[model samples]
Target: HMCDAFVGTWKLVSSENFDDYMKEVGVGFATRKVAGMAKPNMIISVNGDVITIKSESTFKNTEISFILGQEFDEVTADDRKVKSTITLDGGVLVHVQKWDGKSTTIKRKREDDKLVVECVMKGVTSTRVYERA
Candidate 1:
């Protein structure tokens, strides 16, 4: 049971209240608009301690790699922004994305049959839940 259930391809089911989450993270209207219509692609692979996630879409692509339970740096698909010191909090992978004076913590987890991704910053939070394709 040590292996993560996250390994595989996943399709975006629906995002519950994610629009405000992007706004809080400082994502612009154009990007947000595109994000709303575009379907996100997620591919997770793991080998031993190394875990990698490829998040891609028509507008952008991002690859995040890390050792389980350890911290790492992630450069986002949008704008190629970098976020350092990402770790797993419980089963949810956590990362701190910093841009300008604002920072946000992105948390990812598999809950029930859905993949839940949450973003929190400045008392505002948004979540997107996905399912296996």
Candidate 2:
């Protein structure tokens, strides 16, 4: 599976335009401030049809486990209650979350030795780059 490429620990190396993306998702000012300063490590693992993404940071740790194409309740890092779905599209991991009439998408792809995460909300987009840890 293409997802096999993502089954590893990845360290955040850089982030761009994330604060505005957070704002579009309704994250509070204080939380956005703290979240912006956090450099989280993404730990991804797969078991059968279940995929788990564990985010670890000095500020907080969160884990979400789900099967592909299944909608599941998610309490985001910034404390938004949302329904999330994940699907693989041509080697990219596409994740969508919806809540309170709003939605966002995150596309993760493996580019060479880096993991590129693209976050989109409304007209705002953010990119976060990671390297294998």
Candidate 3:
């Protein structure tokens, strides 16, 4: 299944326009600046339809587990409470989260056996390139 392909550790390499994206999402200035400095390592594990994930960095660590296609409340790294859901769209994993009446999306696309996570809010988009670790 497509979920099998996503179970692994990934190292965050490049991030683009993340600061602006975070600002749009109501992240504080200090948190936004520091967030740009840390390259979090993403750990993802899939158990049947449940996907448990964590991101650890120099500044913070956050973990969450949820069933695919089911909605759950999430506390983001910046401490924003959001309703989140993740679903498989063919080979791509699409994640949607809503908070403060605004919606954001994160798409995990498999490219060359690597994970390319793209987060979008409003019109700003931040792309985080991850390689299997």
Question: Which structure among the candidates has the greatest TM-score?
Answer: 2
lDDT of 3 at 69: 90
Tens digits of lDDT, candidate 2, 1-133: 5489899999999999999999888888999999999999999999999999999998789999999999999998888899999999989999999999899999999999999999999899999999999
Worst 10 residues of 1 by lDDT: 77-86
lDDT of 1 at 45: 88
Model 2 stretches with alpha carbons more than 4 Å out: none
Q: How far does residue 114 in candidate 3 sit from its true spot (Å)?
A: 1.9
lDDT of each residue in 1-133, candidate 1, tens digit only: 3337878889887786677877776779988888777778899888777777888788677787776555556666557365455676676678776666668887888889888888787888877888997
**Candidate 1 residue spans exceeding 4 A from truth:** 1-3, 68-71
What are the TM-scores, per candidate, against the unseen true structure? 0.85, 0.97, 0.95
**What TM-score should be assigned to candidate 3?**
0.95
Query: In model 1, what is the error at residue 12, expressed in angstroms?
Result: 0.5
lDDT for 50 in candidate 3 is 77
Give the range of the ten consecutive residues with the poorest summed lDDT in model 2.
1-10
Q: In model 3, what are the clashing residue pairs, if there are any? A: none
Question: All models: lDDT?
Answer: 0.75, 0.94, 0.88
The lDDT, on a scale of 0 to 1, for candidate 2 is 0.94
List pairs with backbone clashes in candidate 2: none
